[PDB]
């Protein structure tokens, strides 16, 4: 599965809902390939390592 470029924004602005800036959910969303649970997850309790 493949996420469009529009789904991929409306993603950002959601997780962006619970207060973190574009650009760390942005490196979270890289981090997890797109995987939003993972996403979530290392916004929280951080990125793999």
Do not use: D
Request: without cysteine; proline residues 4%; glycine residues 10%.
């Amino acid at each position: 599965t493949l996420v469009t470029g529009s789904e991929y924004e409306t993603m950002l602005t959601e997780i962006m809902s619970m207060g973190y800036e574009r650009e760390r959910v942005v490196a979270a969303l890289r981090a997890s390939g797109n995987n939003p649970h993972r996403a979530v997850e290392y916004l929280l309790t951080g990125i793999p390592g």
